[PDB]
Amino acid sequence: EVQLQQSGPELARPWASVKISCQAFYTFSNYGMQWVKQSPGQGLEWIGPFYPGNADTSYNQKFKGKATLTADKSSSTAYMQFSSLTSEDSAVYYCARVVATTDFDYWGQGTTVTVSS
Amino acid sequence: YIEASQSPSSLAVSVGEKVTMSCKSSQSLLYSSNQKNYLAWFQQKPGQSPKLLIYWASTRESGVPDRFTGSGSGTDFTLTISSVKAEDLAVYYCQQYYSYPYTFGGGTKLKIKR
Amino acid sequence: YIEASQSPSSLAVSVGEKVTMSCKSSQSLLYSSNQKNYLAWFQQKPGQSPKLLIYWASTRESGVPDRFTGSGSGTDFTLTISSVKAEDLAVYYCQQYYSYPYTFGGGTKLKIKR
Amino acid sequence: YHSRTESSIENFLCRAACVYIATYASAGGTPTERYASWRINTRQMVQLRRKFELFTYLRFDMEITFVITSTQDPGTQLAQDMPVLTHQIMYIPPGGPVPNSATDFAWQSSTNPSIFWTEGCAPARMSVPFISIGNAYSNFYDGWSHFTQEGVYGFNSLNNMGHIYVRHVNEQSLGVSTSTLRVYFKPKHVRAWVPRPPRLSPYVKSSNVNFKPTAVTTERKDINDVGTLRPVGYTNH
Known part of the structure; x- marks a missing residue:
């Protein structure tokens, strides 16, 4: 029942870097952090997992070569960088956390990245 | 752990008035080799998925209206909207993606004054 | 990529009638060494964050009411609710966490029949 | 670089196998029920056949062991005390006389080695050498019996091994x-x-x-x- 927050929704512009942070309330040993894509037209699509205590970062083939991920375990803040930003990528980005190797227990709060060109 | 503090309260102003907000970070968020500020201002519609406004604090996200302008260098980080709207109700965070962990902000409700 | 197909349509039944649903997976979801089924049935309130009902298809999540019972072994995966409610409106997915990627389901709206 | 001694022909083909189970009575009845017969061959037990038909030609000696177990029969006029049961086992070489009934003359032929065995002792054993006209047994034979290119196909007369016939020596009243x-x-x-x-x-x-x-x-x-x-x-x- 632990809460979960993020950087927040900001109105951005096309081709302007938008980093979506995510707070933490746990440790950083063999656990996982990731996100999804909440768009009614496109349904739900993952974007990439981050693994504290494992030093593994992966991206989807739909955004490979476009998006990058970084995080600081000590600072308790995880980045999800994005490049060549479009206008239809707007979604309610949910921060998913897993304290297990294979599960989905706690979900995020919600942040919007809609832009206007 | 590295966190950041948003304004003490919400905007709590009238509709149609430009709003200025700041995000106080607890540590430096500039990487001197690349001169990049790793922080973004977020926005979450209640009940839906969140979505940020501007990333890198100097590059507005594509598709975002020209009303939002993010600024702030070093530890401080600000944002300005020249036209606040009643249909933009959300929770404003200032999330950082500099290093582990990717901590969120503090929250900012768009309340009612009318 | 490994995905799974939910029922062709929504429940579309009356309130207070037990509902049975199935999730057709495109590949085996049982690891014979551990006899574990890596799939869960999810639930997302419109506008808020999602939340599953039962994980491993045999262990109901703590805090979940006794109305939801997940079953299904191997590729098939089912779920049953002995009392459908009008305040449980959400989108039902059957997400799998077996291997990369962690693909979601298909969606299931709780529509109106009254 | 471990051992191969278990894969040799001797260690691969010298395993005893149960190749026949039969029964016979010791009293009145149909005559064919009073003795047991078997023509020696390796083509009826599929598990042993699959092992012998990895090679085209074979040459070996036969060792045959007989396990005989007798029991009383329900009915009327049960025997209150019987001394002992004795069994006669006869091996007929290829071309020897073959009984057509119990209590026949072929049972007393001097060319057929026989074993007389009493209940209670160790199982009877015999060993037959490589008894054939040719220089090997052949599992696969492509040809005919007669030179007219007609007859039974796939049959060779050079790999006959005889017959085994078992009966009761005692006469039971x-x-x-x-x-x-x-x-x-x-x-x-x-x-x-x-x-x-x-x-x-x-x-x-x-x-x-x-x-x-x-x-x-x-x-x-x-x-x-x-x-x-x-x-x-x-x-x-």
Whole structure:
């Protein structure tokens, strides 16, 4: 029942870097952090997992070569960088956390990245 | 752990008035080799998925209206909207993606004054 | 990529009638060494964050009411609710966490029949 | 670089196998029920056949052990006290007289070695040498019996081994005494030639090599489909 927050929704512009942070309330040993894509037209699509205590970062083939991920375990803040930003990528980005190797227990709060060109 | 503090309260102003907000970070968020500020201002519609406004604090996200302008260098980080709207109700965070962990902000409700 | 197909349509039944649903997976979801089924049935309130009902298809999540019972072994995966409610409106997915990627389901709206 | 001594022909083909189980009565009845007969061959037990038909030619000695177990028979006029049961086992070489009934004259022929065995002792054993006209037994023979290119196909007369016939020596006046025979067969001093590919289709006939077409192997999902897979875990992160 632990809460979960993020950087927040900001109105951005096309081709302007938008980093979506995510707070933490746990440790950083063999656990996982990731996100999804909440768009009614496109349904739900993952974007990439981050693994504290494992030093593994992966991206989807739909955004490979476009998006990058970084995080600081000590600072308790995880980045999800994005490049060549479009206008239809707007979604309610949910921060998913897993304290297990294979599960989905706690979900995020919600942040919007809609832009206007 | 590295966190950041948003304004003490919400905007709590009238509709149609430009709003200025700041995000106080607890540590430096500039990487001197690349001169990049790793922080973004977020926005979450209640009940839906969140979505940020501007990333890198100097590059507005594509598709975002020209009303939002993010600024702030070093530890401080600000944002300005020249036209606040009643249909933009959300929770404003200032999330950082500099290093582990990717901590969120503090929250900012768009309340009612009318 | 490994995905799974939910029922062709929504429940579309009356309130207070037990509902049975199935999730057709495109590949085996049982690891014979551990006899574990890596799939869960999810639930997302419109506008808020999602939340599953039962994980491993045999262990109901703590805090979940006794109305939801997940079953299904191997590729098939089912779920049953002995009392459908009008305040449980959400989108039902059957997400799998077996291997990369962690693909979601298909969606299931709780529509109106009254 | 470990040992290969277990894969040799001797250690591969010298395992005793049960090749016949029969029963016979000790009193009145149909005459064919009062003795047990078996023609020695290796083509009726499929498990032993698949082992001998890896080679084209074989040369070995036979060791045959008989396990005989008798019991009383329900009915009227049961025997209150019987002394002991004695059994006669006769090996008929190729071309020797063969009984057509119990209590026949062929049972007393001087050319047929016989064993008289009493209940309670160790099982009876005999050993037959390589008894043939040629220089080897042949599992596969491509040819005919007569030179007219007609007759029985696939039959060779150079690999006859004889017959085994078992009966009750005693004459029983009170009651019937059913008995059961098991035959254990073993090759010794085995020599094999010209190896062959092992069979794929199931056997259909003991005399023929007839078969049904069978798939060369078991089906697979795809050409690049490796066997199954593993889920994500602590090692795979």
